[PDB]
Amino acid sequence: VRPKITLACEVCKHRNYITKKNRRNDPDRLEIKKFCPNCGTHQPHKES
Amino acid sequence: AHKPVGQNISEVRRNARLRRHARLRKKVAGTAEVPRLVVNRSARHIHVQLVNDLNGTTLAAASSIEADVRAIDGDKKAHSVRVGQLIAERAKAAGVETVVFDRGGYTYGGRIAALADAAREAGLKF
Amino acid sequence: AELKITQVRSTIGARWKQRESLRTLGLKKIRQSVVREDNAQTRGLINTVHHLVEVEEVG
Amino acid sequence: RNGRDSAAQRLGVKRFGGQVVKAGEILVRQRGTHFHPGVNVGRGGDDTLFALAPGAVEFGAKRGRKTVNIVPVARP
RNA sequence: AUGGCCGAUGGGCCCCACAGGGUUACUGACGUCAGCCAAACUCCGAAUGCCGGUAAGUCCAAGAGUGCGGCAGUGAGACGGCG
RNA sequence: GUGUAAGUGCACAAGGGAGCUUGACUGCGAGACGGACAUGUCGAGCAGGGACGAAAGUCGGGACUAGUGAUCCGGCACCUCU
RNA sequence: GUUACGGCGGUCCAUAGCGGCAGGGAAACGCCCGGUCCCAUCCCGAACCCGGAAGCUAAGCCUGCCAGCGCCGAUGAUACUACCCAUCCGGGUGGAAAAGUAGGACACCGCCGAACAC
């Protein structure tokens, strides 16, 4: 299934971005780099 | 009764070059103040023109055929560099400042890259 | 030239275009007559309602 | 079994030849690329053609494709 | 889909091997000289209608359009002419 | 052949392959389409900070049209609100 | 200004295409030689890229001629149709196809560049 999951920042740790993914294709916690507004730069967003 | 069975390699090369030049002409076009620098490269020479597509003319042109750029004893890359400088300040004389580089369906490297940076360092920014 | 146009049939049951063409010509009742010059617009108007009017040439 | 149908999508040409338009005005609403964008005409995510500059819509053909262009009407 | 022609494929029959085979009242693929058909076919393709521009007409009137506000009724239609 | 129904398209590829990458962004948005209303749809362009590319440039998910549920009520994270 | 020349573009992108016959290498366009260098193959210097000019116009290229296959295509007529007559049949004014035919067609135009005389 592709459940709704949340990607939080690393520095301030706000659960900003959400999206779906297959829990069996990528059971490991996702890692992607996205734009964080308040910090104003591009940092990776980690799963919760 | 000597009929070759298939296409010659020259025909295949010409058709492929024309097709992949046309495929890149989708995004590249030249205007009056932003003309298109189209380069044609052969095994012995190289040619460049400044084309304004909306009307279909050539503001400036340069090539290796002319004897002035024939005189340099340098290698083909050197000839391309000289041709790039020549097209650069010919365009300077033509009132053209900014251009778009049409590579003519060839890979951007070797002689083509050589005269590309030759034109770039001569003041024609693109 | 000039055209002499008179209405001979009523507008009852006529389509919207025919009623509007009759009004555009400038006649409202039966036996009413108008005089209009000979131009393409007038020919189109009379062609629209030729079954409701009679066209004589003046002079 | 039958009886299921979809709502009409109101596709087609919105601005016809000679009509003057403003920037960003939708010209045609289409599914495929039946009309291809021309000069001063863009293509949307759903193949919708919209005007990139004010002018008069002009329908033309290019290399066998029917295209839609915008004629830059003369300023008074 | 044919005037359905040849023509695959399978089956029987004849040889008898059951391998190899051939004969059709057999079964008989697709195709095609030519003629066909199609709302869910189109290399074509009108007439009307529709969108816009323009020039006129009506213009002591259509008692015309559009916007806003007050007050509604209607939201079970019938027949006739065309598709 | 285009992930998937059909239609409209795509051979200039939207079809096939490879390299890097996360724009499957934040604040917006002139002008429009469609509509009883609520919905819905397209969008050039501006700023920030990025990806790819030599560059011009393209990128606010997927060739497009289906894959979805208003309001109330409640949960979680942040806020220089009370 | 001229050449059987090389490029970049066009045109409601075949009237241009395909096919046959006959030619040429001045500069060019190519085929060609080799992989030392930039670069490359999901294997291959075949392709891409790089260095050269021994040979060849046999091909690409373009030139001339063929309607051969394709392509374009009238006029007239007709189908159909708007309005109006017409008790059905049908008729009047206007618009007017598709197919077919006569025919056209072996492209045209623009801007630079080569070689030549000025």
Side-chain angles (χ1 to χ4, degrees):
Chain A
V1 79
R2 328 184 114 277
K4 305 213 199 93
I5 47 58
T6 325
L7 326 185
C9 171
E10 306 336 327
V11 192
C12 46
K13 279 198 166 174
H14 319 320
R15 283 180 330 112
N16 287 9
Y17 290 88
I18 76 163
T19 282
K20 316 202 171 214
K21 96 207 178 43
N22 276 15
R23 36 147 191 61
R24 74 221 310 171
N25 288 355
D26 316 276
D28 45 37
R29 274 161 31 101
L30 210 46
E31 209 48 2
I32 210 164
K33 169 154 110 55
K34 279 244 169 185
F35 175 74
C36 159
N38 39 347
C39 208
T41 51
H42 269 80
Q43 329 81 306
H45 280 64
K46 206 185 297 323
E47 270 215 291
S48 197
Chain B
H2 305 36
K3 214 162 181 183
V5 293
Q7 303 294 309
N8 198 354
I9 187 54
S10 154
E11 194 64 342
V12 183
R13 167 143 49 243
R14 181 182 196 77
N15 290 345
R17 183 212 94 91
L18 263 288
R19 164 168 222 205
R20 76 168 97 89
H21 177 220
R23 101 153 61 103
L24 84 87
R25 276 291 319 270
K26 268 178 187 177
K27 278 191 198 86
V28 185
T31 84
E33 81 305 347
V34 189
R36 155 177 62 123
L37 166 60
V38 51
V39 52
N40 273 17
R41 186 213 67 196
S42 49
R44 290 172 195 277
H45 299 271
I46 193 146
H47 331 292
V48 286
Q49 323 183 27
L50 264 279
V51 184
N52 167 45
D53 307 290
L54 54 68
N55 89 329
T57 185
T58 296
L59 330 174
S63 185
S64 311
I65 298 314
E66 71 176 280
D68 166 14
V69 85
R70 268 257 187 67
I72 165 176
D73 192 60
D75 178 68
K76 258 178 283 179
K77 300 199 164 179
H79 309 131
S80 51
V81 165
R82 277 288 302 116
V83 161
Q85 301 157 255
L86 201 43
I87 200 62
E89 92 309 10
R90 281 177 192 195
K92 254 82 161 183
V96 162
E97 158 34 77
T98 166
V99 306
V100 284
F101 185 80
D102 178 7
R103 81 205 198 217
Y106 310 111
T107 316
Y108 184 81
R111 318 196 250 144
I112 277 175
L115 82 173
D117 324 288
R120 260 164 195 157
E121 59 57 17
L124 231 53
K125 55 96 181 183
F126 65 90
Chain C
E2 292 276 330
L3 283 178
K4 165 83 190 323
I5 288 154
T6 175
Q7 182 174 348
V8 294
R9 311 251 335 268
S10 163
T11 178
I12 299 304
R15 291 146 101 91
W16 169 258
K17 290 188 188 302
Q18 288 138 23
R19 300 208 270 279
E20 296 298 300
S21 295
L22 281 177
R23 177 187 131 253
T24 299
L25 278 167
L27 50 91
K28 290 146 139 303
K29 297 186 196 249
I30 324 288
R31 303 193 161 150
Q32 301 200 329
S33 317
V34 280
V35 195
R36 283 175 94 72
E37 77 148 316
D38 201 4
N39 57 53
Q41 166 196 123
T42 307
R43 314 311 320 241
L45 283 176
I46 77 89
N47 175 40
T48 303
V49 294
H50 75 291
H51 62 294
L52 310 160
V53 302
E54 291 216 319
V55 191
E56 298 62 344
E57 291 66 350
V58 202
Chain D
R1 199 289 324 280
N2 317 334
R4 299 160 326 282
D5 198 348
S6 58
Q9 302 307 316
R10 283 104 168 122
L11 313 173
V13 176
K14 299 304 165 192
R15 298 296 182 257
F16 296 84
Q19 288 210 228
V20 315
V21 296
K22 320 170 121 162
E25 212 154 350
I26 293 187
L27 297 189
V28 316
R29 274 256 207 222
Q30 48 176 358
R31 268 298 90 74
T33 316
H34 191 261
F35 295 92
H36 293 256
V39 305
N40 289 1
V41 170
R43 167 142 155 256
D46 56 351
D47 315 275
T48 298
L49 303 188
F50 59 99
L52 299 172
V57 181
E58 171 285 310
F59 279 87
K62 281 290 311 304
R63 303 180 35 71
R65 321 194 207 165
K66 292 184 310 283
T67 70
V68 192
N69 317 277
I70 296 275
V71 169
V73 317
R75 162 184 174 191

